[PDB]
Design a protein around this ligand. Structure first.
Ligand code: B12
Ligand code: ZN
Length: 841
């Protein structure tokens, strides 16, 4: 109700113009119209000399019934006006083409979208530094706002850091005129699954949630039939309203003019589909479309009631490349802290000379390890961390595939890191260590610069040891953090000191109890929040084996008491399912200091002095276990020393198929059951996956293939998935039986899969999933594959897949199924190949 363009978008669906390319390419402006010999061919040079010609292109879409019009602003930026010195006065031009667009639109009332391009220079590939783009956007955009546009479009953006500096620049441009508006970023896309920079469709939206921009959208995409996947994930998933502008397919240059072949009738179908089915709040197509496209869309599709989108995006964070969900509640998020020179010293060996190529290895090795947010701190004696942080992020921001956390000390890095990082991060600036003043500005920086914080229970006083003062952390910060400083519970972690218990003092001995009772007392009221604990530090000032075991049983009760994330190094925990029965009883009553009969601490230490060979390279009691348990335990701890030899022993006893029917389905499944019960954590499940992954590569060559030319079969996972364990075997028994095969990767969004249909023209296509949300994606595939008129065999499965939300799909598509096992997958391939008795009905 506060803004006319949101009154429009919330009510009903409206249409954007075509662009002025194919339209200025049809006016035959001749070089005197550039006003100078050196200003060749420059739109945004014409705005000075020939206002009447661009007014002619403006009014053409207005006569053809458009409802949103771009200003000319494709060049409104210093570093692209000056590209051949073509006039430094951006503001002028911006108030010029905004006035030219208003002069045309005023009788019609169609919305003036101050509508930029992306500029010629990118932040994220290091073509330019943030100040030189932020300056250009900052000075330009205030002339558009002075020009009285109904909103700004930062449209066609090519990089999320280019979005960030453009949004910061547009905000500081509008705010220094005393205003703000429902501004609209919109993003390009490429068939690689991504923007041009490598940003995927999840990273785009997960980043764009962090921003007050009430509208988001797409632009300069390659046509509706290629935009559909992207428009999907945006329209059904986002809170902020979505809009659509395909460039009419793909270009073809004639006589120096770009021209297309998508028709006004076809663009009427595609918006008629998208607007009521998916809910797209505004529509059009700009580059490559005449005024007839927008007319034929306006008559068919304009004024339809704009459909609602959901009240919440999940708990999320985003790198350049990919999103991550912030709340796991199973396989709790692991946070990597090895990028630390102040709470650790590994970082300090590699980063000392300024060797940035070395700090990136220390970042990426923690993801392979298992941690999917990294925590960074370069602070040290006799070194300026805020200058170091210039150098540090110049490598990390475009190298690391996972989001960031920031243990670095000065809140001035809170600003400089948020001026060199893409996406959405978190920061450990809420250490309440310099008091409430410093905290409220830290919580403001968290969002004034997009999105970045973690609560830490350090404070002006120090490390909360008594719980009343510890829950008074959450009382001081959280409420004003979410409800005065913008980051949701689902945008934050929460962290409790994890101080040493094991020094043996009657101060220290109980303290893991303090953390578990608090943690619980805190999830007690923190739903959605990823509780994050620095597990490594509970066991400090004692022998290292008692560090693995106490850290382990602390962490693995912490999930049951309410944990969802942890700051970890996987070398300094083990799983609670491994722990010897006496050692587990010891470790619990040590975590409680529930002492009777003997003291738990010196009982513990003397337990490890008595049981030295148990939690080591055990030459006997572990070896004496039956191989199915031994493999179960290798899958639980991630034991690999002799893993090759125990799988060789299993393969000596039984055939691979009998082994994969056995422990290489069953023992994993038991690890999965124990994992669902909380008896394990992410890096141990990653050790289980790595065990399988390795094992399948040893099982497949002995289970050797036969036959040739049997058919063409491709396989495909689904959007939002990370698993491909099932997938691999779902494929494998089909790959073993003479069919030509192509494999699609772990997370493939659908237009890549359908391009593989269109290019390969196979006899069969795999679909797949190992988790619940694959089912929801199955229906999204099948409903639209039908709307495109496909008839190809696509096969459907997954740990989760179940006939109850699958046989009903037979209605939507003529190829619904559930091979459960890849041996049925082969029997079903032979049916749809015509080799076997089709019985599928
Ligand atoms: C190993 C594992 C992981 C691995 C996966 C790596 C990998 N590449 O596989 C990793 C550690 C990366 C992982 C990640 C996650 N996981 Co996980 N994972 C597991 C686990 C233990 C085993 C999965 C397994 O491999 N099963 C064995 C394979 C062989 O069996 P299958 O998948 O069922 O395959 C059979 C049939 O399903 C069929 N089939 C499967 N696909 C298809 C397709 C077609 C077309 C056909 C006809 C047949 C078919 O064929 C096979 C028989 O041959 C499961 C537990 C479980 N219940 O299985 C959880 C589990 C799937 N994970 C879970 C969760 C919680 C997560 C994460 C959210 C954890 C996190 N990061 O916080 C993420 C998800 C990340 C993401 N973006 O997707 C939950 C999901 C529950 C839910 N309802 O959402 C599960 C079910 C466990 C649980 N109980 O919490 N996990
Ligand atoms: Zn465009």
């Amino acid at each position: 109700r506060r803004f006319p363009y949101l009154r429009a978008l919330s009510q009903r669906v409206l249409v954007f113009d075509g662009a002025m390319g194919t339209e200025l390419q049809k006016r035959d402006l001749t070089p005197e119209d550039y006003g100078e010999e050196a200003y060749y061919g420059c739109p945004e040079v014409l705005n000075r000399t020939r206002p009447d010609v661009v007014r002619e292109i403006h009014l053409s879409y207005l006569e053809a019934g458009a409802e949103v019009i771009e200003t000319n602003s494709f060049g409104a930026l210093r570093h692209v006006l000056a590209e051949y010195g073509l006039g430094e006065e951006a503001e002028e031009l911006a108030y010029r083409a905004a006035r030219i667009a208003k002069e045309a639109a005023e009788p019609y009332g169609a919305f003036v979208a101050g509508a930029l391009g992306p500029g010629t220079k990118l932040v994220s590939l290091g073509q330019i530094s943030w100040e030189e783009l932020f300056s250009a956007y900052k000075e330009a955009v205030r002339g558009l706002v002075r020009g009285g546009v109904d909103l700004i479009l930062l449209e066609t953006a090519q990089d999320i850091l280019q979005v960030r500096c453009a949004v910061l620049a547009a905000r500081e441009a509008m705010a220094e005129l005393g205003v703000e508006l429902p501004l609209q970023v919109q993003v390009t896309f490429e068939a690689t699954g991504t923007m041009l920079v490598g940003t995927d469709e999840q990273a785009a939206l997960a980043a764009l949630e962090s921003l007050p921009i009430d509208v988001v959208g797409m632009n300069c995409a390659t046509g509706p039939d290629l935009m559909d996947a992207k428009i999907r994930y945006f329209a059904q998933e986002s809170t902020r309203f979505v809009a659509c502008l395909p460039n009419a397919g793909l270009p073809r240059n004639e006589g120096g003019r770009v021209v297309y072949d998508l028709t006004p009738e076809e663009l009427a179908r595609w918006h008629l589909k998208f607007v009521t089915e998916y809910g797209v709040n505004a529509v059009g197509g700009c580059c490559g479309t005449g005024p007839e496209h927008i007319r034929k869309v306006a008559e068919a599709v304009g004024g339809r009631p704009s459909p609602v989108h959901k009240t919440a995006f999940p708990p999320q964070v985003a790198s350049l490349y990919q999103a991550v969900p912030l709340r796991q509640e199973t396989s709790l998020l692991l946070v990597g802290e090895r990028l630390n020179a102040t709470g650790s010293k590994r970082f300090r060996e590699l980063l000392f000379a300024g060797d940035l190529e070395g700090i990136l290895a220390l970042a990426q090795e923690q993801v392979a390890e298992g941690a999917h947010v990294l925590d960074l701190s370069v602070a040290w004696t006799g070194r300026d961390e805020l200058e170091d942080m210039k150098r540090v992020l110049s490598k990390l921001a475009t190298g690391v595939t996972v989001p960031f956390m920031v243990d670095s000390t000065s809140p001035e890095v809170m600003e400089e890191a948020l001026k060199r990082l893409p996406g959405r991060a978190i920061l450990n600036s809420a250490n309440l260590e310099d008091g409430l003043e410093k905290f409220d500005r830290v919580a403001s920086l968290a969002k004034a610069h997009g999105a970045a914080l973690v609560a830490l229970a350090i404070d002006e006083e120090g490390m909360a040891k008594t719980r009343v003062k510890k829950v008074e952390v959450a009382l001081r910060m959280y409420e004003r953090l979410t409800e005065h400083h913008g980051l949701r519970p689902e945008d934050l972690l929460f962290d409790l000191l994890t101080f040493p218990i094991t020094q043996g003092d009657e101060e220290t001995r109980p303290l893991a109890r303090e953390t578990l009772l608090a943690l619980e007392e805190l999830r007690e009221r923190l739903p959605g929040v990823g509780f994050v604990l620095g597990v490594s530090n509970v066991s400090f000032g004692l022998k290292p084996k008692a560090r693995r075991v106490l850290n382990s049983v602390f962490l693995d009760e912490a999930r049951k008491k309410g944990l969802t994330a942890a700051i970890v190094d996987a070398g300094k925990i083990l799983p609670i399912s491994q722990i010897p029965e006496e050692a587990y009883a010891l470790a619990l009553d040590l975590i409680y200091d529930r002492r009777e009969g003997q003291d738990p601490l010196f009982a513990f230490i003397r337990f490890f002095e008595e049981h030295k060979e148990v939690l080591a390279e055990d030459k006997e009691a572990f070896q004496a276990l039956p191989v199915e348990e031994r493999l179960r335990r290798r899958v639980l701890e991630g034991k690999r020393v002799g893993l090759e030899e125990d799988l060789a022993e299993a393969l000596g006893r039984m055939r691979p198929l009998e082994i994969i029917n056995g422990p290489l389905l069953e023992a994993m499944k038991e690890v999965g059951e124990l994992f669902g019960a909380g008896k394990m954590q992410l890096p141990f499940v990653l050790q289980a996956a790595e065990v399988m992954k390795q094992a399948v590569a040893y099982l497949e060559p002995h289970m050797e293939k036969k036959g040739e030319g049997k058919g063409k079969l491709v396989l495909a996972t689904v959007k939002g998935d990370v698993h491909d364990i099932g997938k691999n075997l779902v494929d494998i028994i089909l790959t073993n039986n003479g069919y030509t095969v192509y494999n699609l990767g772990i997370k493939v969004p659908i237009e890549e899969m359908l391009k593989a249909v269109d290019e390969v023209k196979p006899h069969a296509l795999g679909m797949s999933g190992l988790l619940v949300k694959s089912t929801q994606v199955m229906k999204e595939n099948l409903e639209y594959m039908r709307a495109r008129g496909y008839t190809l065999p696509v096969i459907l499965g997954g740990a989760a897949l179940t006939r109850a939300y699958v046989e009903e799909l037979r209605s939507i598509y003529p190829e619904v199924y559930y091979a459960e096992d890849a041996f049925e997958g082969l029997a079903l391939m032979e049916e749809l190949t015509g080799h076997r008795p089709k019985d599928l009905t």
